[PDB]
Design a binder for this molecule. Sequence first.
Ligand code: HEM
Ligand code: HEM
Lengths: 443, 443
Amino acid sequence: HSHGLFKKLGIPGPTPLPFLGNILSYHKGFCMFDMECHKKYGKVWGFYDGQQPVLAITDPDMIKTVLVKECYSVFTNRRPFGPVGFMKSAISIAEDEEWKRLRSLLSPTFTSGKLKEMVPIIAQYGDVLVRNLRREAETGKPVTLKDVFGAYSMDVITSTSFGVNIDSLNNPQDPFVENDPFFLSITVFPFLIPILEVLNICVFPREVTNFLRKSVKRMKESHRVDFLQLMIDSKALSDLELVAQSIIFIFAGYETTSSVLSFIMYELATHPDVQQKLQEEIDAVLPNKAPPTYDTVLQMEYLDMVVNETLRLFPIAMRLERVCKKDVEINGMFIPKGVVVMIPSYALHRDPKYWTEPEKFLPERFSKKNKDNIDPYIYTPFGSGPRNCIGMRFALMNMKLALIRVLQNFSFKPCKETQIPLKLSLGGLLQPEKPVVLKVESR
Amino acid sequence: HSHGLFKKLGIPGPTPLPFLGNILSYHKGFCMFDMECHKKYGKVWGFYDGQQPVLAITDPDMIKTVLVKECYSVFTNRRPFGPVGFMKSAISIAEDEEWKRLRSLLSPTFTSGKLKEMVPIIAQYGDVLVRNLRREAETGKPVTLKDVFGAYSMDVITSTSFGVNIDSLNNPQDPFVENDPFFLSITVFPFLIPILEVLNICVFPREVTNFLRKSVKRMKESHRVDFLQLMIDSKALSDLELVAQSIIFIFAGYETTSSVLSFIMYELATHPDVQQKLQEEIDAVLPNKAPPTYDTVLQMEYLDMVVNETLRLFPIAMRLERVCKKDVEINGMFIPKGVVVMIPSYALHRDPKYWTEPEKFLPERFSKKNKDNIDPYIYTPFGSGPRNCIGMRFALMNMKLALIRVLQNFSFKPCKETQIPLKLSLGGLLQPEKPVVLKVESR
Ligand code: HEM
Ligand code: HEM
């Protein structure tokens, strides 16, 4: 019974219940629980995910020590969840030297030279997204963004990860990836995890994967550029190791790209002045609906300010977590072994200590005048340090290339069904209660 | 399902059954299973303790690499058993840097200077053992050795570990330590170990310990020398850490000292020529039943030859085990991570490759002429390397000091109930089927 740990260290926090800990406070959500704790407990507090002590830090120098300084020594891996199966070889689930080999083997896949080669492929579906948009604009009714953006993010994934060119929205019969009530029990009962592993049970639907893996056996052997072809050229890797990384690239590129693009278009439709100014910049850099290029995207500054400010209001990861590998003492406080150090990214992005009017959508926070006054460890939408988001530059380029072609042809206004203000899904995922619906008018 | 590992590496061994592995071959015992495997599979073979692959090595250079060379790097810890409770801080159960701190903090307790201070204490009970022997000799009937030796080993433990002077055989109402059907299930079902730990269940009777711990709270604080006083003088230790080590000293000093002394007196009674020659040397170094001292024991060579030769026939540990911490390659073979490397000490001590007439009791193998021709890694009754038996010199001095006072007064002859030949307990423990009973005559 380690529930007396945070009071044995003099660290404030909510009082844990037996077995459950503080998981009953998650009825508001992880975001609201972190904002309420940071408000009443200060810079450092602790809580218990069942029997697992979780220490939350908000000090920028202390965050820098965890994410960047003592990364390879103390804070190398995140906390493990339940039955992972063969997915233990995922770069995000790998630990210690196992991860260092994968992070070094997959880093060249996200080079500035390799990414510029991917711009023409994902810009093709930017035209396909407009094709499905023009129809759902000429059909004359509000459009659910997560459908067209989910299809776009799916098409971008398949062509960049394997090259299987599909129109996910127009070919939904073959998607082929249409893929609390247990994870609440799994964290309070971590002793049941080895039982599910020996039963071949996994948190992911285990019957999947196998149909995505046998497709790599025919195309890897029996001039095209994609994530797969860049991994085969590369001690050396395994065939099953190649499958696990491609699965984590789809999960990290599907729900993330669509949700952020959904939050962005919600902020643009609710702020026509920002949408008006952004479309003027898009028309200025790209005259007469010019095709967006790699060098063109990296020039539009107001587009970068819009993407950065929406990621502040909605950091879809919510938290940054590291596992304390041994008894250490960082920046003046003692961290015992086994404690999960957590960085509340959502709570820090809405703190009046660093942001003026946190609930407001003000893209001018990230202009070249005020961008220098932003702490790189208070604003971490992609994490930081050696274990940051390895697909950060790919996601930014993928999302912006869609925002240009979408705004080059359409203006977005709210509808009667648009949930204003937007209510964050009290669930576990950082999304909105009711899906975003907007009016799409042709320019 | 890792049962194809040893055949994926080209390593011979018995074919494992699902779930069970090769545990059904333990109906003969660990000793006979290791002798049958070393006979038909050669220098290296592998088997499965349920789902745990165990690689057995017999090459002396390969044993030296595991026990001595790559000890701190690869082969640092032994395999873990079931619910350990607070006993995870035991030096023998500790792992990695946690063990290095305990092995360094407890090594001075077994110094040649500290041990010579313990000789007068354990020689006192050598007189008490003769006192109970003279009565059970004058009572005129065969004597069960494990009773008088178990009481002697218990009295030596209590006085050396805490100083509580008792006559365990004459005060058995207050001992106070009178302390397969589950461990076979626990190794085939290792997924049930975390369940027993969270239920406060331990492999040891958990209701014990607590009554031995509250006695240290009154005597540690509220000039005497013992194992306890030598540990208090000593980053620094914890109070609960001091309790765990004293428990492992009793378990390692009770069953081991009594059983080896039981095997020795069986070999002496069945070989009167060895008992006659040993008593003549004891009378020569110690004239007229002289009291044995520290320097006297280290002079009797034939006594050392008798103790060493009995430990060859009965290495009560049977096996030496280390856990492979990472993928390595020792002396020309690849050892994957997680494989338990095992040294069959019993099988090596009875191998005709290094011993002539292995089943014979010939103390002349360890004379100063033939002791140089014995490989220190084929004969390992106390292990080897940094994680060898830390109480080796204490056990040798404790057992010899009893053998001198016992043989200074009594001769030992077999009886009608003496099991000849001695049948090793088919159980898990390295002992004899039926307890040893001998005739004790006064000189
Ligand atoms: C808007 C889009 C995205 C956001 C906001 C985002 C955010 C994040 C964050 C906050 C982390 C944790 C960083 C840390 O713990 O220090 C992370 C990790 C990671 N992300 Fe993303 N991500 C996005 C898209 C992607 C994409 C498109 C990919 C791949 C194609 C990707 C692959 C990964 C991987 C593999 C990791 C784990 C890296 C490791 O453990 O070494 N992410 N991401
Ligand atoms: C005839 C008596 C004894 C024999 C034959 C014996 C044998 C052994 C063997 C074979 C090992 C394993 C070595 C290895 O794995 O490399 C061991 C370990 C150990 N023994 Fe003994 N032992 C005896 C008595 C004792 C006594 C009297 C004590 C303490 C008072 C003791 C304390 C220990 C400890 C603590 C370990 C584990 C050391 C570590 O893990 O670092 N043993 N013993």
